[PDB]
């Protein structure tokens, strides 16, 4: 359901240095976090999101 192109919402679940925020903090469900991570990694590959703050 979570789409990697839905780029506006992705910063809500990543930090400044590109860290993926853990579910314990964001409170997202386990199922959604798994697909969320896939979306984030997918976006990073397309240069839509940064892997880290250093490039």
């Amino acid at each position: 359901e979570i789409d990697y192109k839905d780029i506006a919402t992705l910063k809500n679940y990543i930090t400044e240095s590109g860290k993926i925020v853990p579910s314990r903090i964001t409170g997202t469900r386990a199922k959604y976090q798994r697909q969320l991570a896939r979306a984030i990694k997918r976006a990073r590959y397309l240069s839509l999101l940064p892997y880290t703050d250093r490039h």
Binding site: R44, S47, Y51
Partner: protein
């Protein structure tokens, strides 16, 4: 005969050829009884990180439904086309036509 989602970024200097490539790629699938369910030209966008000493790329979206061979034979063309860099394809179960 499955649903596919195709994203490919081209060299910014080739921003004037993107309409041509879309027609050729669309023609190839439509010739094999396929049909395009979504087409979107996202324009030149800022890259999150540089690729090959390059910072701006032209983004487009292409969600299609076609047989195995036409995408498989389309991938090889993507490889040797220097204009396009870092293309991706995906598998989907249902056709989607949203603005996104």
């Amino acid at each position: 005969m499955r649903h596919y989602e195709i994203v490919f970024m081209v060299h910014p200097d080739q921003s004037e050829q993107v309409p041509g490539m879309i027609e050729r790629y669309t023609a190839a699938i439509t010739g094999a009884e396929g049909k395009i369910h979504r087409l979107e030209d996202w324009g030149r966008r800022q890259l999150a990180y540089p690729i090959n000493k390059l910072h701006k790329a032209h983004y487009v979206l292409m969600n299609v439904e076609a047989p195995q061979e036409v995408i498989d034979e389309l991938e090889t063309t993507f490889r040797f086309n220097d204009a396009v860099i870092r293309s991706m394809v995906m598998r989907t179960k249902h056709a989607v036509t949203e603005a996104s």
